[PDB]
Amino acid sequence: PKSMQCKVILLDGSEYTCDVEKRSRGQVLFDKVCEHLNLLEKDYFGLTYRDAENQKNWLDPAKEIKKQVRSGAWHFSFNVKFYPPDPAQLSEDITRYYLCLQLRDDIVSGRLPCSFVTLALLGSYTVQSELGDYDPDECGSDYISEFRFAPNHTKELEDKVIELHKSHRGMTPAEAEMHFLENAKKLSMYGVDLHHAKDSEGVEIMLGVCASGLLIYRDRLRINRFAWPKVLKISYKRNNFYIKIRPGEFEQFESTIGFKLPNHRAAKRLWKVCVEHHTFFRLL
Numbered sequence: 346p347k348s349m350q351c352k353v354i355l356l357d358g359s360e361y362t363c364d365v366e367k368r369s370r371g372q373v374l375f376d377k378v379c380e381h382l383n384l385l386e387k388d389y390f391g392l393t394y395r396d397a398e399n400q401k402n403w404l405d406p407a408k409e410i411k412k413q414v415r416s417g418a419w420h421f422s423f424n425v426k427f428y429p430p431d432p433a434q435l436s437e438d439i440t441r442y443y444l445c446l447q448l449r450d451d452i453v454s455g456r457l458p459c460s461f462v463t464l465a466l467l468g469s470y471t472v473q474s475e476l477g478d479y480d481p482d483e484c485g486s487d488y489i490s491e492f493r494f495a496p497n498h499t500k501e502l503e504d505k506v507i508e509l510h511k512s513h514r515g516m517t518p519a520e521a522e523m524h525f526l527e528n529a530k531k532l533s534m535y536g537v538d539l540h541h542a543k544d545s546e547g548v549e550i551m552l553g554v555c556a557s558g559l560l561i562y563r564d565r566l567r568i569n570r571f572a573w574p575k576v577l578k579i580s581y582k583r584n585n586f587y588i589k590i591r592p593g594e595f596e597q598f599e600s601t602i603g604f605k606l607p608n609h610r611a612a613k614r615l616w617k618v619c620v621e622h623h624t625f626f627r628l629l
C-alpha cells in the first residue's frame with residue numbers, strides 16, 4: 346500500500362510531515378493535521394496548496410489529493426477557511442488560539458488592513474498571551490519585540506504595543522486571545538477573501554467573499570453588498586462568474602450581474618468559495 350509524504354506549514358510557521366496512501370482523499374490528511382494540533386472544532390479550517398500558476402486553492406476534503414495537486418508537490422498550509430463572525434461562541438480556547446495565529450498572519454501580510462492603534466492593541470494582546478505580564482527587565486527605551494505585528498514596523502508602533510501591554514497585568518492567555526478576537530472581528534476586511542475581476546464594462550473591481558455575503562469594491566465611493574439571502578444563484582462559464590440577485594418585493598424578475606475573471610480556473614475557484622461560504626453561513 347504505497348504512501349506519499351505530505352508537508353504542512355502550520356500557523357506558527359513550523360512544518361508537520363506525515364504520510365498518507367497515494368489515493369487518499371483530502372479529509373485523511375486534514376484529520377491527521379487536526380489530531381496533531383489537538384483541534385476538535387475542525388469545521389472552520391482547511392488545507393491550501395499552491396497550484397501550477399502558483400495561486401492558493403483549498404484542498405477539497407472529498408476528492409483525491411493526487412487529482413488536486415496533479416503535477417505539484419504534496420506541500421500544503423493549514424488555514425482558517427470560515428472566519429467566525431463571533432469567535433466568543435466557539436466552544437474551545439484552542440480553536441480561538443489557531444484563529445489568532447491566522448489573523449496575526451493576515452495582519453503582517455497586509456491582507457487585513459488595520460489602523461496604527463488597532464495594530465498596537467492586537468500586538469499588546471499577543472504579547473500578553475505569549476510573554477504574560479509586562480516586565481521592564483526585558484524592555485528598555487530601545488525595545489523591539491521578536492513578534493511581527495504589522496506589514497511595516499516603526500519604533501512608534503513598538504512603543505505603543507508596550508504602553509498597552511502594561512495595562513493588561515493579570516490577563517491569562519485565553520483572556521488576551523479573546524480580547525484580540527473581539528477587536529479583530531470588527532475590522533472591515535475581517536474574513537474577506539478578495540478576488541480580482543472586471544465588471545461587464547471591463548472596469549477592474551474586487552469581489553470579496555465573507556460570512557454575511559458578497560462585496561463588490563468598485564472605486565471607493567461605491568461598495569455594493571449582496572447579503573447571502575439576496576443572492577438566489579451563482580454560476581461560472583468560461584472566464585465568467587455570474588450572480589442572480591433576488592427581485593425586491595413586487596418586481597417580476599431577478600437581476601444578473603456578470604464578471605470577467607483572469608481565466609477559467611479563477612472563475613471556478615471564486616464560484617466554489619462562494620458556494621462553500623453560502624452553505625456554511627446559511628447553517629450558522
Ligand SMILES: CN(C)C(=O)CNc1ccccc1
Nearest residue numbers: 533557558559560570571572
Ligand atoms: C465590510 N464587511 C465585511 C461587511 O460589510 C460585512 N457585511 C456585509 C453585508 C452584506 C453583504 C456583504 C457584507
